[PDB]
Design an enzyme around this catalytic site. Sequence first.
Site, PDB file in Angstrom:
ATOM      1  N   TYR A  22       2.771 -12.566  25.906  1.00 34.26           N
ATOM      2  CA  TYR A  22       3.191 -13.214  26.854  1.00 34.26           C
ATOM      3  C   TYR A  22       2.664 -12.687  28.242  1.00 34.26           C
ATOM      4  CZ  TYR A  22       7.028 -13.979  30.395  1.00 34.26           C
ATOM      5  OH  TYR A  22       7.834 -14.531  31.497  1.00 34.26           O
ATOM      6  N   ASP A  70     -13.050 -25.323  25.747  1.00 37.06           N
ATOM      7  CA  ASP A  70     -11.994 -26.102  26.658  1.00 37.06           C
ATOM      8  C   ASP A  70     -11.611 -25.179  27.805  1.00 37.06           C
ATOM      9  OD1 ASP A  70     -11.042 -28.004  28.002  1.00 37.06           O
ATOM     10  OD2 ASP A  70      -8.743 -28.088  26.707  1.00 37.06           O
ATOM     11  N   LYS A  88     -10.578 -23.489  31.272  1.00 42.19           N
ATOM     12  CA  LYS A  88     -10.007 -23.957  32.608  1.00 42.19           C
ATOM     13  C   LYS A  88      -8.918 -23.249  33.148  1.00 42.19           C
ATOM     14  CE  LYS A  88      -7.300 -27.159  29.647  1.00 42.19           C
ATOM     15  NZ  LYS A  88      -6.663 -28.567  29.259  1.00 42.19           N
ATOM     16  N   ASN A 124      -5.832 -22.703  31.281  1.00 39.39           N
ATOM     17  CA  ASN A 124      -5.479 -21.878  29.972  1.00 39.39           C
ATOM     18  C   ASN A 124      -6.215 -20.369  30.268  1.00 39.39           C
ATOM     19  OD1 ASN A 124      -8.398 -22.326  29.631  1.00 39.39           O
ATOM     20  ND2 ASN A 124      -7.979 -24.061  28.166  1.00 39.39           N
ATOM     21  N   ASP A 153      -5.342 -20.911  24.267  1.00 42.56           N
ATOM     22  CA  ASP A 153      -5.341 -22.104  23.792  1.00 42.56           C
ATOM     23  C   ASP A 153      -6.772 -22.287  23.184  1.00 42.56           C
ATOM     24  OD1 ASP A 153      -5.490 -25.142  23.948  1.00 42.56           O
ATOM     25  OD2 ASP A 153      -5.876 -25.327  25.993  1.00 42.56           O
ATOM     26  N   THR A 192     -11.290 -31.326  29.058  1.00 45.41           N
ATOM     27  CA  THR A 192     -10.516 -31.832  30.260  1.00 45.41           C
ATOM     28  C   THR A 192     -11.612 -32.283  31.134  1.00 45.41           C
ATOM     29  OG1 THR A 192      -8.865 -30.041  29.914  1.00 45.41           O
ATOM     30  CG2 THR A 192      -8.949 -30.959  31.997  1.00 45.41           C
TER      31      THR A 192
HETATM   32  C1  LIG Z   1       0.981 -25.779  24.975  1.00 43.11           C
HETATM   33  C2  LIG Z   1      -0.199 -25.273  25.639  1.00 43.11           C
HETATM   34  C3  LIG Z   1      -0.985 -26.755  26.238  1.00 43.11           C
HETATM   35  C4  LIG Z   1      -1.513 -27.559  25.188  1.00 43.11           C
HETATM   36  C5  LIG Z   1      -2.440 -26.674  24.448  1.00 43.11           C
HETATM   37  C6  LIG Z   1      -2.979 -27.661  23.335  1.00 43.11           C
HETATM   38  O1  LIG Z   1      -2.279 -28.228  22.646  1.00 43.11           O
HETATM   39  N1  LIG Z   1      -4.363 -27.752  23.141  1.00 43.11           N
HETATM   40  C7  LIG Z   1      -5.188 -28.508  21.924  1.00 43.11           C
HETATM   41  C8  LIG Z   1      -4.428 -29.677  21.749  1.00 43.11           C
HETATM   42  C9  LIG Z   1      -5.165 -30.329  20.565  1.00 43.11           C
HETATM   43  C10 LIG Z   1      -6.258 -29.835  19.947  1.00 43.11           C
HETATM   44  C11 LIG Z   1      -6.684 -28.365  20.466  1.00 43.11           C
HETATM   45  C12 LIG Z   1      -6.276 -27.820  21.509  1.00 43.11           C
HETATM   46  C13 LIG Z   1      -1.764 -25.679  23.832  1.00 43.11           C
HETATM   47  N2  LIG Z   1      -1.174 -24.661  24.853  1.00 43.11           N
HETATM   48  C14 LIG Z   1      -1.235 -23.204  24.695  1.00 43.11           C
HETATM   49  C15 LIG Z   1      -0.422 -22.652  25.536  1.00 43.11           C
HETATM   50  C16 LIG Z   1      -0.358 -21.113  25.311  1.00 43.11           C
HETATM   51  C17 LIG Z   1       0.226 -20.311  26.355  1.00 43.11           C
HETATM   52  C18 LIG Z   1       0.981 -20.956  27.319  1.00 43.11           C
HETATM   53  C19 LIG Z   1       1.652 -20.207  28.454  1.00 43.11           C
HETATM   54  C20 LIG Z   1       1.910 -18.800  28.121  1.00 43.11           C
HETATM   55  C21 LIG Z   1       2.504 -17.289  28.581  1.00 43.11           C
HETATM   56  N3  LIG Z   1       3.278 -17.539  29.699  1.00 43.11           N
HETATM   57  N4  LIG Z   1       2.192 -16.385  27.922  1.00 43.11           N
HETATM   58  N5  LIG Z   1       1.319 -16.701  26.942  1.00 43.11           N
HETATM   59  C22 LIG Z   1       1.143 -18.325  26.815  1.00 43.11           C
HETATM   60  C23 LIG Z   1       0.581 -18.903  26.036  1.00 43.11           C
HETATM   61  N6  LIG Z   1      -0.981 -20.628  24.520  1.00 43.11           N
HETATM   62  C24 LIG Z   1      -1.585 -21.583  23.588  1.00 43.11           C
HETATM   63  N7  LIG Z   1      -2.303 -20.834  22.564  1.00 43.11           N
HETATM   64  N8  LIG Z   1      -1.834 -22.785  23.646  1.00 43.11           N
END
Ligand SMILES: C[C@@H]1CC[C@H](C(=O)Nc2ccccc2)CN1c1cc(-c2ccc3c(N)[nH]nc3c2)nc(N)n1
Length: 274
Positions: A89, A133, A135, A138, A151, A161
């Site tokens: 987190y 990816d 940015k 992330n 991510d 993106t």
């Molecule tokens: C949901 C978000 C946006 C879409 C992305 C996606 O779908 N990419 C994708 C889609 C399709 C294919 C490949 C990749 C996946 N995303 C995340 C978000 C977070 C996260 C966020 C806030 C946090 C906080 N405050 N502490 N920790 C956190 C951790 N962590 C991971 N691993 N992935």
Amino acid sequence: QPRKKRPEDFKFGKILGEGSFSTVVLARELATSREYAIKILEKRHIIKENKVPYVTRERDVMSRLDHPFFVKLYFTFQDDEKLYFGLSYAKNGELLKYIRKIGSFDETCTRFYTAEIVSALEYLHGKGIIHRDLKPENILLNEDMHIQITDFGTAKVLSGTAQYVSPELLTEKSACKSSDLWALGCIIYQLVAGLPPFRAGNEYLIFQKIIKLEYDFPEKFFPKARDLVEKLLVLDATKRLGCEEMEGYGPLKAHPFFESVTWENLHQQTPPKL
Ligand SMILES: C[C@@H]1CC[C@H](C(=O)Nc2ccccc2)CN1c1cc(-c2ccc3c(N)[nH]nc3c2)nc(N)n1
């Protein structure tokens, strides 16, 4: 290893992040009072949308990473409908939010945060992993205001993106460590200028600009930062500072923009106030 966890082991709270294929929710583990960002995926949706390879890739990469500048995967579990990934987190959310909030960074802040991103990529690339990816959305900030990169679904393990897409994607449908270095160039630009270098009305026009290297620097751009960005935003991927053909991270970390940086223990240093 501790027993498998389950949904009932947690009190869930607010949504931390949302995408088409998953949602990240803040959760407190009841037995320990620890807070995790739990990523929740619906198995049926992931299958129907053919996303299994990305989910598997993220789980496998985020498990292997053991460095302070990365969000870590601590545990996984499932119920009938859903997969759950217990992640670090990062309480202060996205780097993008800070850029929007303060406008653009001064040189001390640009240098510190760029140095942390460089040191994170050095670790990642040293493991033969490319993000693909990267940015500001992330690159997260922890409670102590150090970065934590997340991510990893698009990550490539060595045998995106629009605004941050490297030209080799647009012309070859390929990517290498150097694609992450191109993203780094765009991010440094955005920290300094307050906006990404390739901007336009729609995705198509952004892609047009990228392949022609059509961008320019504002007058207020720190000159050493400008020189660095110019050595990263290069169409020929083998000529980007930091890539293997340019002999790697040594020459990148030695760039004059980083003169005052102590590279050894960045995670231990106090970040400059934003
Ligand atoms: C949901 C978000 C946006 C879409 C992305 C996606 O779908 N990419 C994708 C889609 C399709 C294919 C490949 C990749 C996946 N995303 C995340 C978000 C977070 C996260 C966020 C806030 C946090 C906080 N405050 N502490 N920790 C956190 C951790 N962590 C991971 N691993 N992935």
